[PDB]
Amino acid sequence: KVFGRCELAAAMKRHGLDNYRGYSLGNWVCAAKFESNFNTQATNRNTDGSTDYGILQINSRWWCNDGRTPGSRNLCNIPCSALLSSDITASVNCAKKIVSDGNGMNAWVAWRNRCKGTDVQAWIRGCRL
């Protein structure tokens, strides 16, 4: 599924991401925008054996298990295929874990480079929330 901007904001808000660990909703929408372009089926297969999965491009070394990545920790305790669903619940819960483990949103390279220090509120502006 390729989400719309306001549709993803609403779904992320229903999941409690607005101000989760001090990160406003716009930060989360912005991260998904430049990680996956709102595409729940996005994958990025890396040369190190790992793969980035889903709308927030969560990496398979630490966070999810795909059975083909060295050093697998599966800290979200899910198969990576769960991050490729049309519903974002599994990705949201794992993203919460990533931030909950003390990383912050800097863990997403797209957020650090394209959302950090920008008007992230623009990504939810005008939406029915």
From Swiss-Prot:
One Gene Ontology term of the molecular function aspect: beta-N-acetylglucosaminidase activity
Gene3D superfamilies given in the database record: 1.10.530.10
Residues passing through the membrane, by range: none
GO cellular component, one term: endoplasmic reticulum
Predominant location: secreted
Catalysed transformations (reactions): Hydrolysis of (1->4)-beta-linkages between N-acetylmuramic acid and N-acetyl-D-glucosamine residues in a peptidoglycan and between N-acetyl-D-glucosamine residues in chitodextrins
EC number(s) recorded for this UniProt protein: 3.2.1.17
Domain C-type lysozyme: 1-129
UniProt keywords, alphabetically: Allergen, Antimicrobial, Bacteriolytic enzyme, Disulfide bond, Glycosidase, Hydrolase, Secreted, Signal
InterPro entries: Glyco_hydro_22, Glyco_hydro_22_CS, Glyco_hydro_22_lys, Lysozyme-like_dom_sf
Domain of life: Eukaryota
Expression sites by tissue: In the egg white and polymorphonuclear leukocytes.
Keyword field contains Secreted: yes
One BP annotation, GO: defense response to Gram-positive bacterium
Binding-site list for substrate: D101
Enzyme kind, highest EC tier: hydrolase
Disulfide bond positions: C6-C127, C30-C115, C64-C80, C76-C94
Active site: E35, D52
Keyword Repeat set for record: no
Intracellular or extracellular location(s): Secreted
Family stated for the protein in its record: Belongs to the glycosyl hydrolase 22 family.
PANTHER family: LYSOZYME C
Subunit structure: Monomer.
Function summary: Lysozymes have primarily a bacteriolytic function; those in tissues and body fluids are associated with the monocyte-macrophage system and enhance the activity of immunoagents. Has bacteriolytic activity against M.luteus.
More about this protein: Lysozyme C is capable of both hydrolysis and transglycosylation; it also shows a slight esterase activity. It acts rapidly on both peptide-substituted and unsubstituted peptidoglycan, and slowly on chitin oligosaccharides.
Protein name: Lysozyme C
Organism, as annotated: Gallus gallus
High-level lineage: Eukaryota, Metazoa, Chordata, Craniata, Vertebrata
